Design a protein around this ligand. Structure first.
Ligand SMILES: Nc1ncnc2c1ncn2[C@@H]1O[C@H](COP(=O)(O)OP(=O)(O)OP(=O)(O)O)[C@@H](O)[C@H]1O
Ligand SMILES: Nc1ncnc2c1ncn2[C@@H]1O[C@H](COP(=O)(O)OP(=O)(O)OP(=O)(O)O)[C@@H](O)[C@H]1O
Ligand SMILES: Nc1ncnc2c1ncn2[C@@H]1O[C@H](COP(=O)(O)OP(=O)(O)OP(=O)(O)O)[C@@H](O)[C@H]1O
Ligand SMILES: [Mg+2]
Ligand SMILES: [Mg+2]
Lengths: 257, 164, 257, 257
């Protein structure tokens, strides 16, 4: 019945344009035209990884029948304590280059060789604070030896990791900060989320002063929490047979968090 | 994950008559592979390091050429044209060169290793078996990266002037 | 498009004949004829790699009709955690004497045949502290066996590595320091960058007291930042259709740092 | 806007040549020549630190082509509970070397190398009483081993700390003392502030008996308070459209102290 699909929209993930996302896309384009490496910093629930996904999608690969593809933007999330062979394996896999085995020195040479001719312009690294300290040398090498901009993405832990090596601090000195929601921006967001994401059989009227009090204490400005609290309350309302989010179950959900 | 790319390699097109040693050598410079790395990717193991030396003592089987065909995107029947035809005896000690034709197509032709070939017919010139100036013997055709003598650094195209 | 022809110029890198470059080259020559090893130290944005590279190109390798190229000067940047084989392979491939599979004793015997005959007078090792501690045995060996000057280039950490091994500390005791710009020298360099690098269709007059305040705060004397800030501000200005850098656009760029 | 610029001027520092500072510079120059360690003592608002910074800038680094500079005066200020590694760390940074990971013996051995080669004649330590008691062993050691005048600068509490250690007191007995302003000297100095610092559009007549009583009670002879009070009285008066300071407005400010 109709009730079964509705978990899926709620559970299903989506991207909503927001001021913070637009700000990055334009700044990254300055960096990509200029071929300047830089870093993006901010708290872990500000939605940094998602903004970078949205950016990647705007520049599709071009592929002919025979020769290899043009791919302007590369995005990678390293694993914890990611070493040199692991970094080169991820750059190589995001392009689906078929060769899979090799010595660390062979992957190094092979990675430089697939970034060239393939025409990469920007390399984005997410949770870059996971990089094992010696792998920043292979990143400094990619950045100086090829006309490729490198964009490190992380939390305030990224900085503490950068400040331990003058060689790295200086190539990556410029940066942009992802901030939290507040005031009218938090209010307008909430409203967008109701019209663009929840779409329930009857409005939940979230901008009301009494509901914004409950959301603000529950979420403390993180877009992450706001999305999770709202969807959880919506599904949990629909499964109880209500046609909207009930203030009573919004209060119940906000009690767990 | 990738945004809708097809799995790929730096493929290369074979020339009109190059030897399997030379072709594999180009393939593993277009992609940066070692000889045992290419053999491992093909799943035939250390076999490739014989073929680059022309050590065809046990000859390349149909199943081994098909394994290489799955890497290099050339079918087993076009790979077989880079080896001697059935009963055409080759020699794998003196690597040999026309050099006059190397300006028309930079490759080691398989026919220069046949025991029956002594002159290139396109140019009616005696085939070389050493560098005409320093007398050095040529490297195996997989290693023809520079297209010149490894000792005196004379281009193979200039050995056109010094032969017959 | 005239606009496009120019942004692609400002994207690229160039060399300016600063007093610091002329000072290095005049020092290295003494050492070359004297055949003595030495090291060069300084902070990571002082442009050590560039001044050394520019030197390498002042001495084109020579060729006669018979014997191999004579190659007075070699420059190499090794890989991080560089082993003995990795050092020998990179020396040997710079000289273009390609070498097969062999064990490490075979890489050494070949490293000496390629450094002999072919005249080699100086070896320059960039980022010398990428070397594993044992490789210095190979570096000393070469320096003492053949009349080849070896120059080690690096940051303050390089000396922390060297002072661990008294064997090395003594062969490479002499040194030179790359330093940051200041006073009249920063101001003269800024005026040089404007007429030499930027070449914008009308003057911006960067040596003005008001602009030197912004540049001195933004760059802190590193030639790296000075070159980076000015390219970034010129590209940003031209993309807006401005014929010059202005005070406000230079501040909007400097505020990212 | 005029007032805006006068706020932006008067919120900043300046240096006035005064007898106390000319006396310090003649005294320290004798100690730099004769290489004897000594101390500068006096009350906390006498301007000992402006006198020492004014001295440092008369002896800037003398930079040659390729050696480290000669740095006649090194001036440092320790953080609270300064240990043996923090003292070497700051000496090393002040001469622009990067400090890397190691143990205590390494910082000390490296400190002596950068103090040597680089001409260093005098080391000035401000707020000397932030030093942990054991670090004085390293301060004496340098002062005896190398041709270095160490100057300890501080308040009367410094001597209370020093008298706890017979070994130190005896290296650092020689002293200059800063005092307070009085009589003709306080009166003459007030007029120097009007002509060189305040720079408002008409004479405020601060040297008159009726105004000197206000300032004397307000400042008690400390150059610090005099500076601070005349700057606040100038700022406050300019915002109300006066060209000067007057009896009531200066009493309005003084009544805060
Ligand atoms: N632009 C956006 N549109 C819609 N939802 C968003 C957006 N940005 C973030 N979110 C929401 O944020 C949550 C995921 O947060 P996300 O992974 O983007 O955070 P992050 O700051 O990248 O995390 P971390 O730094 O810890 O890796 C999801 O609920 C997702 O819907
Ligand atoms: N001599 C120079 N002339 C012109 N531009 C220069 C010069 N030196 C440096 N630059 C500019 O500043 C940048 C930094 O210089 P460079 O990369 O050589 O620094 P470095 O001191 O070798 O760095 P590191 O020590 O961190 O490896 C260059 O990419 C270039 O844009
Ligand atoms: N000789 C001077 N010339 C100009 N301005 C001065 C002079 N002496 C003091 N001042 C001004 O008055 C202030 C008085 O503080 P000062 O810098 O003298 O501190 P200090 O007494 O040396 O500090 P400490 O608490 O360490 O003893 C200075 O910051 C400066 O603004
Ligand atoms: Mg993320
Ligand atoms: Mg460098």
């Amino acid at each position: 019945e109709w009730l079964q699909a509705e978990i899926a929209r709620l559970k299903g993930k989506s991207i909503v344009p927001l001021q913070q996302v637009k700000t990055l896309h334009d700044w990254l384009d300055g960096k990509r035209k200029a071929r300047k490496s830089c870093r993006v910093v901010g708290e872990s629930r500000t939605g940094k990884t998602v903004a970078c996904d949205a950016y990647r999608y705007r520049h599709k690969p071009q592929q002919e029948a025979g020769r290899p593809p043009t791919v302007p933007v590369v995005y990678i999330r390293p694993h914890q304590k990611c070493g040199p062979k692991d970094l080169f394996k991820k750059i190589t896999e995001y392009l689906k280059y078929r060769v899979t085995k090799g010595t660390v020195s062979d992957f190094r040479d092979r990675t430089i060789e697939v970034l060239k001719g393939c025409g990469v312009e920007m390399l984005i690294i997410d949770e870059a604070d996971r990089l094992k300290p010696e792998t920043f040398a292979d990143v400094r090498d990619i950045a100086e030896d090829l006309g490729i901009a490198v964009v490190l993405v992380g939390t305030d832990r990224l900085d503490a990791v950068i400040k331990r090596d003058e060689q790295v601090l200086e190539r990556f000195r410029a940066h942009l900060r992802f901030g939290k929601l507040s005031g009218e921006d938090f209010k307008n967001t909430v409203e967008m989320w109701e019209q663009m994401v929840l779409k329930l059989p009857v409005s939940s009227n979230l901008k009301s002063k009494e509901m914004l009090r409950i959301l603000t204490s529950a979420t403390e400005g993180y877009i992450g929490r706001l999305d999770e609290i709202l969807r959880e309350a919506a599904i949990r309302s629909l499964s109880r047979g209500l046609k909207k989010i009930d203030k009573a179950v919004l209060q119940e959900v906000a009690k767990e968090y | 994950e990738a945004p809708d790319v097809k799995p790929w390699l730096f493929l290369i097109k074979p020339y009109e008559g190059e030897s399997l040693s030379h072709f594999l050598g180009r393939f593993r410079r277009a992609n940066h592979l070692s000889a045992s790395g290419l053999g491992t990717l093909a799943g035939i193991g250390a076999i490739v390091a014989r073929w680059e030396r022309f050590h065809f003592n046990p000859r390349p089987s149909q199943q081994e050429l098909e394994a290489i065909a799955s890497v290099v995107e050339v079918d087993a029947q076009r790979l077989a044209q880079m080896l001697p035809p059935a009963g055409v005896g080759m020699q794998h000690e003196p690597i040999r060169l026309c050099g006059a034709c190397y300006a028309e197509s930079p490759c080691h032709r398989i026919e220069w290793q046949y025991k029956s070939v002594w002159k290139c017919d396109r140019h009616q010139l005696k085939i070389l078996a050493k560098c005409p100036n320093c007398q050095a013997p040529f490297k195996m055709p997989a290693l023809w990266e520079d297209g010149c003598c490894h000792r005196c650094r004379m281009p193979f195209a200039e050995m056109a002037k010094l032969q017959k």
